[PDB]
Amino acid sequence: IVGGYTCEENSLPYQVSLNSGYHFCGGSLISEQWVVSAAHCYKTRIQVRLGEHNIKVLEGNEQFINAAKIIRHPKYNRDTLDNDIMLIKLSSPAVINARVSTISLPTAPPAAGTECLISGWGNTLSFGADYPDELKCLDAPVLTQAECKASYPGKITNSMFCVGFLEGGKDSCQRDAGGPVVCNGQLQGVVSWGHGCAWKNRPGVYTKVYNYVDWIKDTIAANS
């Protein structure tokens, strides 16, 4: 997260990280046993960490749960990034408490102008490359599809939308992928891609979670 701030320590119980020897992506806890992430964050083996604030300093609230199933959307396209969404079933249900809890799926599509909260342990660009130990947060508005397509001619599919600032300076960045864009308590976006981070006229591009509610519900049910 570039140009953001440190999230309040306890405050985003739904934010998880994906690990495979090291932290490589984020994710969101949507039910006791299911996590939503990005398809480009797929690895054959993944350990999900929950309840983290500082990924290097344990405060006792942290859980370490292996992924039992890792399911990319069947229509994920690794070249165009169309349908960049993924589900992970935890090997055991998360223990629910103040530091580890779920976020709602969206009940309506993202509305332009709505202020959202984007979070993760991604590059902050604060001193050249800077991968922070503490979870970072960014308040940022949903942009119109017109603004999105103007920023990325040729590249914005139906699965995608932009959240951020056309002026640049504030954005998600590397290691943030798979993490949450939450708007009014609902998971509207998954951190996906962008041209650079925090460039002028190049806001982050996010997967539109609302388009996948049925797939998510069906997938979860098919894997009970």
Partner 1 sequence: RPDFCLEPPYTGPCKARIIRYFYNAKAGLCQTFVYGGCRAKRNNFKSAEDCMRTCGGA
Most distant CA atoms of the chain, gap in Å:
47
Please, what is the minimum distance in Å from the beta carbon of residue 200 to Ca ion?
34
78 is a contact residue toward partner 1 (CB under 8 A): yes
52 is a contact residue toward Ca ion (CB under 5 A): yes
Q: Which range, of 15-23, 53-61, 92-100, 126-134, touches Ca ion by CB under 5 A?
A: 53-61
SS3 letters for 74-94? CCCCCCCCCCCCEEEEECCCC
Tokens 């951190």 found at: 191
**Between residues 29 and 81, which has the closer beta carbon with respect to partner 1?**
81
Per rule CB under 8 A, count of chain residues that contact partner 1: 28
When binding is defined by CB under 8 A, the residue of 11, 24, 149, 199 that contacts partner 1 is: 24
Please, what is the minimum distance in Å from the beta carbon of residue 178 to Ca ion?
18
- Is residue 115 a known part of a binding site? no
When binding is defined by CB under 8 A, the residue of 11, 61, 101, 174 that contacts partner 1 is: 174
Please, what is the minimum distance in Å from the beta carbon of residue 62 to Ca ion?
5
Residues in contact with partner 1 by CB under 8 A are 22-25, 38, 40-41, 78-79, 81, 122-123, 129, 131, 172-178, 191-195, 197, 204
Residues in contact with Ca ion by CB under 5 A are 52-54
